[PDB]
């Protein structure tokens, strides 16, 4: 029941919310490949400008609320470069979350609006740096998964077909389709190997963390037992 | 045994009988 | 012979029915013979006349 | 006589309360892979019950490329209902519809 | 599926419910009675499973509608059952509810606060209003009437406010508003709700204890006698009702104390059998738990299965006879009860044929329902729930998955010369798939070749239907018959109700033409992919280009793959915009391509490509 | 297409003032008189239907089957596009005493 | 387990929405996924 | 390809007999079936055609055994067995075996003595087949692509040793 | 709730609205007019002409037939209007199409004018035909009519009549005229053209419980009658074997031994 609705959040049959968008960024997977190789793009400008022919759709969209959104975003995020996650700015949500991607120019996922400007910067090279942009914007516009894609379906097919080439045995943890299982399947609560994976810090050495390694693991007497007479 | 698989239209997808039914022999 | 396209899927009455004079009658009779005659339609609007005639005259 | 007069003016009353004004409609512009499908295989149906088409089929025998045809010049008289997940719906014509 | 033949009414929901039995002796077409199905000659006989009232058999006609068994529907009948049998079914739900009452105010023994505290709740849940349900325990004041009542009144003011205020708002309809959270709230509820009814031993209303039930496998229950603590108990507590004026129970005796119960109880039932609230306004009564009557199901679905010659006796049919025995039997032994009595004293015999009495019908009411709660018999024949259920299910075997017309399997052959998005179909194929084209101005010369050309030279057309409904097979005509019902396609019709219809001609599947072709197991849907068909004289073998080799993960080493044939414009504008091959070069698991030329054509690229090839 | 269309689609008979495919029958005719589908559920049997002033029942009310026997309304029929095992299921439900209730629009 | 959950759905007195691909499949309804997700109108001129 | 079938008359008083009753003949049997109800050895029979005749008295009319399979075949053996008796001899028990020939038909699997099986794609015509300056076209033709995954490098030394030893 | 469910019935078949007796004609007025709602299906050959489409598909079968809903015999309609799909200022409106098949349905408002003849209604016919057991006549010479012998008074008498046919005669002593007036009886719509029974002759007729007691030789009459017409029709295209004897001789059946 799961699919795409014409709001872009994706809905269960009952029309219970699952998500509020696709991967956090409405993206069609059978597009989204050339959507960073942008020097093919460029390569490629007015071939691509004429496929995705604009004329028949300047009358129809926003140019200009989610551009100017964007920058008020990237602004309060530049400012909390080296703060932590958990003292980040909470002024200004995503520009997805506040216009329709279908509907304004310039309503891109943040990770594609780093990667787009980090390229324009990295590299300076008749089409301009600014018309670029906007062909890339336009490009991601065309890249939208379609409302009523059965997204659920998809989803459930592109983790069972792959799954079925890892059936052959290891060559410690529990992997392929048996620990698949524990996740999807059983949502185990008693994992058969269960881990915990302890982030070190710098000032603790290779000999330290050594010692703090047996200060933790369980010592039986039996190790510690050579040989025991009994008379 | 291919040859058996070649002619038979599947009714769904395989089946549990090996160790999911032994994982689903749980009560809540 | 009873179907979709021949017969309708439901016939509800919006409203009671209310009562038409003789000369009422015979002004719709009049207006509905005159639109239809501007298949099998041609033999209710033949029975139809009879009403008509029998509204004013004699057969 | 009494009691479906009002039974109808629920279900209109309903049926207003669901639709979107044209102005208010908030939708993709463009007509999804799925519009497109459903309005060829459609009016190509309708076509095959000798419904009026608006377009010189040049020797075309198939329907359905007579549909194509009818979409290029944007002759098709359909309307798109696009329903959301309350109920509520946008109606769109293939006219305005943004075709790749 | 004909498009000249449409749909007005449509299904919107579909509601469960229990049969009452008033309301099948009501709609039954004749009552059974009679354990034999045929008399002597040959001709069924009157009273039995296969009585012409329940729908025509054996080349007689129906007697409800008068029709012949390819037209008649079939008619249901009913069993009156000489004594009420619990229905397997629900007999765990109206056991709880048994364990749960108490045998002397007939009200559950949890305090009647806390059943109202339940009912509550359970009455905001049937609106969409989890928030309120929580807030309904905030209400707080060996605790006097007078106290209770205000605390009872409070909670139920809160109830009807809250539903109000909500109802004012877009927050719940008068059908009210129902969510997996809620569903999930109301299971959590309605499960607490039946623990703490099980819970209580001493009954919170009436100080007096009730007798324990227990059960079997089967549906029988018994009556654990008090202990003498419990005895002494019901004699102290004995005044106080005059001033306000192990042993097998039969079903009747379960049905009477279960029936005043859930008369008592009435309030808090009614939203515990009720997902969303009762606008039927129908009262919960205990007897749909109870089976008086059986519903005999249409001769149309208890057919005796031919196997070649021999003729099989029907399974249900076979299970329905033993249910018809038992009741004719108690019938006897209810007639010899009615004769004698002055002389009595040993009743120990009395209850012991009734007892037998009860036990034997209600096993054959089992074993009709389901075998697997019936005792052994010396395989048993499968019941309603294992026809559901038999292997897979009717539902994942015959509903989620069906045997299709208009398709085709045959082992598939490699071909480099076809396109990558076309499909080589075997001329044997091509004169026996065909499609409903219906004739037109547009099409009238293509379609008349077809009908002059017939089912065995391609392209031609195996058959013609008419607009009055009826079909002209071209089979068995010769050209002469061919060229003259081709003259005839275009004519006008002169019925009026059939004017809006025009002829059809099932022409052989053509070049122009969508299949979707499947290699199992289908782990993705590019594993089913819409071909355009290409009819390749002398071949014996679907013909498959090398690019579609790695969506259907096939390999041509003996594989085989089902060709579907869909037989409307709608589903074939989606095998060629949506399923088609075309649209599928890119996998939606990674966004990577899964289309290419394989290995030939690989060494070829390598040899043309390279500079010393002028 | 597949799973209906070209498998077990049948057009049925049910009553929408009921909502069943199980309890709709054609109605048994006169020599001049046509068939019509009825519903043996919300029919009331000739005889029991007793009576302000007396009311007189239309004519076109009043259905006979096979047996003989008159009956009063259940005239509220209809005809849905449906599977067939969906005809037999609700066959099955109704012999465990479990009723399908079709709300069928429009009304 | 098809009869199992068919009698908490008697026993709730639950009303199937038919919203559900599998609950549409049953009833014969068109799937409400992909091309089932919206309505076909035809603009007819007459008044 | 042979396949037998035995014809038993079992299913203690005889009342099937092979041959055909008088008074009762439905049209053209006699074309498949000598006099005595068994098949001519030789005829050929398709899905439908009686592959033997016989009478039982229960009854009172001539039925046949027919014979069903996709495949046509021809009557190679008909071999009557009247066993299991002292001195009451009939005959009830008869063994017929069918002659199915099987030219290569696409789809048949061939394959040399080092494990490279492939279905057969196609029957190529010898002018549309690679012709040697010997002036021969090869009988079967192996894909290269087919070696480099398998390793049957065994195939490869018994192609130059066939040759060598061909000469 | 003893008299609750069984309430709703009665309001089922209560008649709406009577016929009313005026301008001291003595005649009843039947003809109405009911404004009603229709579902109606729309050829993909109407699609650019909708309202001739309703009217040729489903409107023209309707007129001069007995629609059971409006409780008469629709004599036409007046203002066909079409209700748009979509909820709204134009002439183009919208209609919804079916998923499986190419039509599309829409409901329609239009008025009736119909025939809605009640029983007890007082109407008048011209006399068709007069046979020895009944009396044909013709209301609005169009709609059929007939008089049985049992409801024809006891005081008349039929005449038949010599060299071409017959006559009845009133209490008086005098032949009945063209036109008679009648009560309604009964009228038969299950058939395929609309038949009014009426009666010449028309609760406190107890005598010491005499009105409950029947006077069978009078039921005996309109019975006897009854059944006598039911049994001729139903040997009407009666097919019987044909039983040839032991011997080469055809049994035949025929009770007059003679020719
Ligand atoms: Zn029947
Ligand atoms: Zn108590
Ligand atoms: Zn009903």
Redesign the pocket.
Request: charged share 10%; hydrophobic share 20%; proline share 0%.
């Given at each position: 029941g799961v699919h795409v609705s014409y709001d872009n959040s994706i809905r269960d049959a009952d029309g219970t919310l699952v998500q509020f968008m696709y991967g956090g960024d409405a993206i069609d997977i059978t597009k989204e490949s050339h959507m960073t190789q942008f020097e093919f793009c460029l390569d490629n400008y007015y071939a691509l400008l004429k496929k995705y022919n604009p004329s028949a759709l300047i009358e129809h969209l926003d140019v200009e609320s989610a551009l100017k959104y964007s920058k008020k975003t990237l602004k309060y995020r530049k400012k909390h470069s080296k703060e932590p996650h958990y003292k980040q700015s909470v002024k200004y949500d995503p520009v997805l979350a506040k216009y329709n991607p279908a509907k304004y120019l310039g309503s891109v996922s943040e990770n594609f609006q780093d990667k787009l400007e980090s390229f324009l910067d990295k590299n300076s090279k008749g089409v301009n740096e600014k018309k670029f942009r906007a062909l890339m914007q336009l490009k991601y516009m065309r890249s939208l998964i379609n409302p009523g894609e059965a997204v659920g379906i998809i989803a459930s097919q592109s983790v069972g077909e792959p799954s079925t080439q890892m059936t052959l045995n290891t060559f410690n943890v529990t992997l392929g389709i048996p620990r698949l299982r524990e996740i999807v399947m059983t949502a185990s609560a008693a994992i058969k190997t269960p881990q915990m994976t302890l982030p070190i810090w710098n000032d603790v050495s290779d000999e330290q963390a050594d010692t703090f390694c047996k200060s933790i693991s369980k010592v039986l007497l039996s190790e510690v037992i050579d040989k025991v007479i009994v008379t | 045994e291919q040859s058996h698989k070649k002619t038979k239209q599947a009714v769904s997808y395989d089946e549990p009988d090996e160790d999911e039914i032994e994982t689903m022999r749980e009560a809540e | 012979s009873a179907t979709t396209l021949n017969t309708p899927v439901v016939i509800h009455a919006t409203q009671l029915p209310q009562h038409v004079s003789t000369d009422e009658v015979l002004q719709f009779l009049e207006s509905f013979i005159d639109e239809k005659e501007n298949t099998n339609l041609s033999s209710s609007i033949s029975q139809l006349k009879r009403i008509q005639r029998d509204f004013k005259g004699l057969p | 006589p009494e009691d479906f007069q009002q039974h109808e003016q629920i279900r209109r009353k309903t049926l207003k309360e669901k639709a979107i004004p044209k102005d208010q409609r908030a939708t993709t512009p463009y007509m999804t892979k799925y519009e497109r499908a459903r309005i060829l295989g459609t009016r190509a149906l309708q076509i095959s019950m000798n419904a009026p088409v608006f377009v010189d089929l040049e020797g075309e025998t198939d329907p359905l490329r007579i549909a194509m045809k009818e979409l290029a010049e944007k002759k098709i008289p359909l309307v798109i209902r696009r329903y959301l997940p309350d109920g509520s719906f946008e109606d769109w014509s293939v006219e305005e519809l943004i075709v790749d | 599926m004909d498009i000249s033949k449409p749909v007005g009414s449509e299904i919107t929901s579909v509601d469960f419910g229990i049969l009452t039995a008033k309301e099948i002796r009501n709609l039954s077409a004749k009552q059974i009675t009679n354990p034999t199905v045929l008399d002597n000659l040959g001709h069924p006989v009157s009273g039995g499973l296969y009585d012409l009232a329940l729908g025509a058999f054996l080349r007689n006609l129906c007697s409800t509608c008068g029709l012949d068994e390819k037209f008649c529907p079939g008619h249901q009948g009913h069993i009156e059952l000489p004594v009420p049998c619990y229905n397997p079914l629900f007999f765990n739900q109206l056991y709880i509810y048994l364990r749960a009452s108490?045998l002397?105010?007939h009200?559950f023994?949890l305090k009647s606060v806390e059943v109202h505290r339940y009912a509550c709740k359970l009455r905001l849940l049937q609106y969409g209003l989890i928030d309120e349900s929580y807030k309904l325990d905030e209400i707080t004041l060996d605790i006097s009437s007078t106290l209770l009542n205000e605390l009872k009144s409070k909670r139920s003011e809160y109830v009807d406010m809250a539903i109000a205020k909500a109802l004012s708002d877009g927050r719940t309809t008068e059908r009210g508003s129902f969510t997996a959270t809620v569903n999930d709230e109301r299971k959590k509820l309605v499960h607490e709700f039946h623990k703490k009814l099980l819970s209580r031993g001493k009954?919170d209303?009436?100080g007096?204890f009730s007798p324990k039930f227990r059960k079997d496998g089967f549906t029988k229950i018994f009556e654990t006698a008090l202990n003498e603590k419990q005895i002494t108990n019901n004699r102290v507590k004995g005044f106080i009702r005059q001033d306000m004026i192990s042993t097998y129970i039969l079903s009747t005796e379960v049905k009477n104390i279960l029936d005043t119960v859930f008369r008592k109880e009435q309030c808090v039932l009614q939203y515990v059998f009720h997902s969303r609230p009762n606008l039927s306004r129908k009262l919960v009564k205990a007897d749909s738990f109870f089976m008086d009557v059986l519903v005999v199901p249409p001769t149309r679905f208890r057919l005796p299965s031919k196997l070649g010659e021999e003729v099989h006796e029907n399974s249900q049919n076979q299970l329905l006879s033993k249910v018809l025995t038992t009741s004719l039997l108690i019938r006897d032994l209810n007639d010899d009860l009615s004769k004698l009595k002055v002389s009595l004293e040993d009743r120990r015999v009395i209850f012991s044929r009734l007892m037998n009495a009860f036990v034997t019908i209600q096993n054959d009411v089992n074993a009709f329902i389901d075998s697997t709660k019936a005792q052994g018999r010396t395989v048993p024949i499968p019941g309603v729930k294992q026809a559901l259920e038999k292997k897979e299910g009717l539902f994942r075997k015959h509903m989620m998955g069906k045997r299709v017309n208009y398709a085709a399997r045959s082992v598939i052959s490699p071909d480099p010369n076809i396109e990558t998005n076309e499909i080589g179909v075997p001329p044997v194929f091509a004169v026996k798939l065909t499609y409903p084209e219906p004739v037109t101005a547009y099409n009238i010369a293509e379609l008349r070749q077809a009908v002059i050309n017939g089912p065995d030279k391609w392209p031609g057309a195996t058959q013609i239907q008419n607009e009055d409904g009826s079909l002209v097979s071209l089979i068995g005509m010769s050209v002469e018959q061919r060229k003259a019902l081709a003259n005839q396609l275009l004519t006008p019709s002169s019925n009026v109700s059939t004017h809006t219809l025009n002829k059809k001609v099932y022409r052989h599947i053509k070049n122009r033409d969508v299949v979707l072709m499947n290699r199992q197991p289908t782990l993705h849907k590019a594993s089913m992919m819409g071909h355009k068909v290409r009819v390749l004289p002398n071949e014996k073998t679907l013909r498959l280009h090398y690019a579609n080799t790695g969506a259907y993960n096939a390999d041509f080493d003996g594989d085989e793959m089902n060709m579907h044939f869909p037989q409307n414009e709608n589903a074939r504008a989606e095998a060629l915009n949506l399923a088609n091959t075309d649209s599928q070069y890119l996998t939606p698991t990674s966004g990577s391509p899964v289309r290419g030329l394989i290995q030939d054509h690989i060494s070829a690229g390598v040899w043309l490509t390279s500079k010393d090839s002028f | 297409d597949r799973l209906l269309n070209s498998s077990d689609y049948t057009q049925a008979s049910v009553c929408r003032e009921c909502g069943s495919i199980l309890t709709t029958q054609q109605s048994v005719p006169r020599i001049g008189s046509i068939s019509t589908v009825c519903c043996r559920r919300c029919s009331m049997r000739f005889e029991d239907a007793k009576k302000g002033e007396k009311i007189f029942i239309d004519d076109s009310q009043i259905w006979e089957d096979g047996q003989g026997n008159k009956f009063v309304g259940g005239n509220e029929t209809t005809t849905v596009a449906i599977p067939f095992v969906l005809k037999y299921l609700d066959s099955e439900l109704s012999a465990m005493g479990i009723r399908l209730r079709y709300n069928v629009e429009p009304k | 387990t098809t009869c199992q959950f068919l009698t908490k759905a008697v026993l709730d007195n639950e009303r199937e929405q038919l919203d559900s691909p599998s609950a549409r499949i049953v009833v014969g309804k068109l799937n409400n996924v992909g091309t089932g997700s919206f309505d076909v109108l035809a603009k007819v001129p007459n008044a | 390809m042979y396949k037998t079938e035995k014809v038993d008359l079992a299913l203690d008083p005889i009342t099937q007999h092979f041959g055909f009753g008088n008074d009762e003949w439905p049209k053209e049997w006699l074309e498949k079936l000598d006099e005595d109800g068994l098949p001519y050895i030789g005829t050929y029979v398709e899905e439908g055609d009686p592959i033997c005749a016989y009478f039982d008295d229960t009854l009172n009319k001539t039925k046949i055994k027919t014979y069903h399979s996709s495949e046509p075949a021809y009557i190679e053996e008909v071999n009557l067995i009247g066993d299991e008796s002292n001195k009451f001899q009939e005959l009830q028990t008869v063994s017929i075996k069918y002659r199915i020939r099987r030219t290569p038909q696409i789809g048949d699997k061939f394959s040399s003595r080092h494990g490279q099986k492939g279905v057969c794609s196609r029957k190529w015509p010898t002018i549309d087949m690679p012709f040697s300056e010997t002036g021969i076209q090869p009988d079967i033709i192996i894909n290269p692509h087919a070696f480099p995954s398998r390793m049957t490098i065994g195939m490869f030394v018994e192609s130059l040793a066939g040759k060598a030893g061909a000469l | 709730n003893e008299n609750r469910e069984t309430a709703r019935f009665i309001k089922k078949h209560k008649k709406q609205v009577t016929n009313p007796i005026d301008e001291k004609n003595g005649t009843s007025n039947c003809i109405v007019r009911v404004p009603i709602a229709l579902y109606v299906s729309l050829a993909p050959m109407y699609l650019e002409n909708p309202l001739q489409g309703v009217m040729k598909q489903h409107l023209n079968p309707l007129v001069m037939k007995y629609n059971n809903k409006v409780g008469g015999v629709v004599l036409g309609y007046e203002g066909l209007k079409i209700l748009d799909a979509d909820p709204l200022d134009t002439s183009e409106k919208l209609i919804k199409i079916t998923p499986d098949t190419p039509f599309g349905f829409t409901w329609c408002h239009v008025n009736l004018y119909v025939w809605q003849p009640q029983v007890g209604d007082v109407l008048e016919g011209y006399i068709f035909i007069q046979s020895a057991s009944h009396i044909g006549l013709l209301i609005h010479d169009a709609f059929n009519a007939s008089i049985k012998k049992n409801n024809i008074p006891v005081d008349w008498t039929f005449v038949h009549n010599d060299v071409e046919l017959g006559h009845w005669v009133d209490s008086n002593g005098e032949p009945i005229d063209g036109k008679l007036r009648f009560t309604v009886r009964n009228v038969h719509t299950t058939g395929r053209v609309v038949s009014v029974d009426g009666t010449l002759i028309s609760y406190n007729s107890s005598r010491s419980q005499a009105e409950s007691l029947p006077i069978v030789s009078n039921k005996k009459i309109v019975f006897d009658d009854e059944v006598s017409i039911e049994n001729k029709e139903s040997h009407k295209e009666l097919d019987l074997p044909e039983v040839k004897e032991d011997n080469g001789s055809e049994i035949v059946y025929e009770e007059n031994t003679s020719e």
């Open positions: - | - | - | - | 108490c002397f105010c009200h023994r009954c209303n009436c007096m | - | - | - | -």
